[PDB]
Design a protein around this nucleic acid. Structure first.
Ligand SMILES: [Mg+2]
Ligand SMILES: [Mg+2]
Ligand SMILES: [Mg+2]
Ligand SMILES: [Mg+2]
Ligand SMILES: [Mg+2]
Ligand SMILES: [Mg+2]
Ligand SMILES: [Mg+2]
Ligand SMILES: [Mg+2]
Ligand SMILES: [Mg+2]
Ligand SMILES: [Zn+2]
Lengths: 192, 37, 136, 23, 69
RNA sequence: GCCCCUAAGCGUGUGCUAAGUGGAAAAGGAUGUGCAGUCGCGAAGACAACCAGGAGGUUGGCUUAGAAGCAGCCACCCUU
């Protein structure tokens, strides 16, 4: 597994603060900070359409090559501020990474498969914490529940990781709990 | 005729139309015939 | 009905209906949820009504979480009383709901039935709400 | 009744700038 | 030719089937018994081979909660 | 504030509204119309219309007076 960086144009911000930031978002740009082991925070604007499309295609942890005044820098999406109501990206934290660097990242665990017919699959962890190379970060880990019967408890230690990928979350975390499907009687008691 | 603020297609043969500024549902089943008002 | 077992202060100032919810704004237990778009006091009677609507629609084979508990008391004075003579006795239990707050969550295998069930619940609530998923 | 409503609504005129005595 | 479900009933030795196809297993029926039902149903099936006809009969066994092994 | 009552624009440029909306109102209902943006299918003939096929095990188990795809419950297989 090896991901190619996605190119985004970025320009250094002339002004900082909420006034400047609100204007940037109104003109369709998202403010971002780039910070790094090199301890050299840069203040950037990204195009909102382009950045959003990258996140749709490659998930929250996409690897980007930023073009800053003509200098290409490799960076990883560290964190996103998303407005609870508008669902727009307000701000991005970008971490500078060199190739072959270990990065701790939270990845999305998808559930695939037909559980046994009387079963309900409940997912208790949306996410797991992983160590991987900058370029080897899987965009999604899939666990299969295709066969498990009631009572089974898929834990984080039981999920397939590609080569290079290490588990930082402790193995005892429940990712999937499989339970026998509630009766109508149990629905009526739950939350009464 | 049903006359209600909410008019909904009751079966898959119900068609929503606008006629003379009213929303209406016309259908082959005369029970489902209804008018916004 | 959901009532707290005890409260330290049985007569409280009204909860303030200001600001966007800073906590509980995402679906954390189920795959679908109801997200508030308006400020309201949601009472325990409305929560019960909404939850039973969801249960009836799915019949069985699903799980409903209620992310909101009505622990805020609202008082009422006895009927036909003049102003004054002390604060009324507690009468309603409400949750202070802010826009962005996820009120109900549902896990169900079928998306179509799940969305319909949550719509049935929304019509029971005093506010405007939308269906939200775990996905971005 | 409509009297109260109409009286208060007239505050939203350009000249009142959204305020008026007695609402 | 008699109903395939009734042939499964007589092959399993039970008088009524499961009310919960998945949550119950009234009995067990060898693939050999299923193949014999297929051969005796050959005048009433779309299948080309007896193997496919037996798979058809095994579909009926699933829907009525009979284990085929 | 600037058509006339009524001093000053029936001002200029580009759009929007058909409701006299403008010149009151909620939950909610709704192929109204404009602008922008995700995603599906399509010249390997899509969407609408019309011609033809839509089936065999089988009336799938259970429940019932009965239940044959079409009260209800469980499962939802296989073949040409
Ligand atoms: Mg908080
Ligand atoms: Mg009144
Ligand atoms: Mg004049
Ligand atoms: Mg003017
Ligand atoms: Mg003119
Ligand atoms: Mg003019
Ligand atoms: Mg014009
Ligand atoms: Mg008017
Ligand atoms: Mg209105
Ligand atoms: Zn109809």
């Amino acid at each position: 597994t090896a991901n190619i960086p996605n190119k985004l144009t970025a320009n250094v911000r002339t002004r900082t603060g909420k006034g400047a930031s609100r204007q940037a978002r109104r003109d369709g740009k998202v403010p971002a900070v780039l910070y790094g082991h090199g301890t050299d925070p840069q203040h950037l604007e990204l195009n909102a359409r382009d950045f959003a499309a990258v996140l749709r295609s490659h998930g929250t942890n996409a690897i980007l090559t930023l073009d800053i005044e003509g200098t290409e820098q490799l960076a990883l999406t560290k964190a996103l501020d998303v407005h609870p109501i508008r669902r727009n990206i307000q701000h991005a934290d970008l971490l500078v990474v060199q190739r072959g660097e270990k990065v701790t990242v939270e990845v999305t665990v998808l559930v695939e498969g037909d559980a046994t017919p009387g079963t309900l699959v409940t997912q208790d962890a949306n996410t797991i914490e992983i160590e991987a190379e900058a370029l080897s970060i899987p965009e999604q880990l899939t666990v299969s529940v295709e066969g498990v019967e009631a009572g089974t408890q898929i834990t984080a230690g039981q999920i397939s990781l590609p080569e290079g990928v290490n588990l930082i979350s402790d193995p005892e975390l429940l990712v999937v709990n499989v339970v026998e499907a509630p009766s109508a009687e149990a629905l009526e008691e739950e939350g009464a | 005729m049903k006359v209600n603020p909410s008019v909904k297609p009751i079966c898959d043969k119900c068609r929503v139309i606008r006629r003379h500024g009213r929303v209406m549902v016309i259908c082959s089943d005369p029970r489902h015939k209804q008018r916004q008002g | 009905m959901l009532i707290p077992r005890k409260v330290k202060h049985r007569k409280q100032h009204h909860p303030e209906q200001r600001g966007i919810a800073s906590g509980g704004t995402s679906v954390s237990f189920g795959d679908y949820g109801i997200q508030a778009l308006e400020h309201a006091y949601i009472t325990n009677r409305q929560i019960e009504s909404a939850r039973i609507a969801i249960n009836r629609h799915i019949k069985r084979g699903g799980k409903v979480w209620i992310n909101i508990f009505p622990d805020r008391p609202l008082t009422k004075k006895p009927a036909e009383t003049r102003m004054g003579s002390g604060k009324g006795s507690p009468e309603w239990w409400v949750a202070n709901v802010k826009p962005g707050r996820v009120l109900f969550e549902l896990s169900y295998p079928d998306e179509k039935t799940a969305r319909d069930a949550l719509t049935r619940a929304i019509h029971k609530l005093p506010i405007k709400a939308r269906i939200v998923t775990r996905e971005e | 009744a409509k009297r109260g409503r109409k009286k208060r609504d007239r505050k939203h005129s350009k000249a009142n700038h959204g305020k008026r005595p007695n609402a | 030719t008699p109903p395939a479900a009734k042939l499964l009933l007589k092959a399993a030795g039970v008088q009524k089937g499961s009310g919960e196809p998945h949550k119950t297993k009234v009995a067990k029926v060898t693939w050999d018994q299923v193949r014999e039902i297929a051969e005796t149903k050959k005048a009433d099936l779309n299948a080309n081979d007896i193997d496919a006809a037996a798979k058809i009969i095994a579909g009926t066994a699933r829907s009525m909660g009979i284990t085929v092994e």
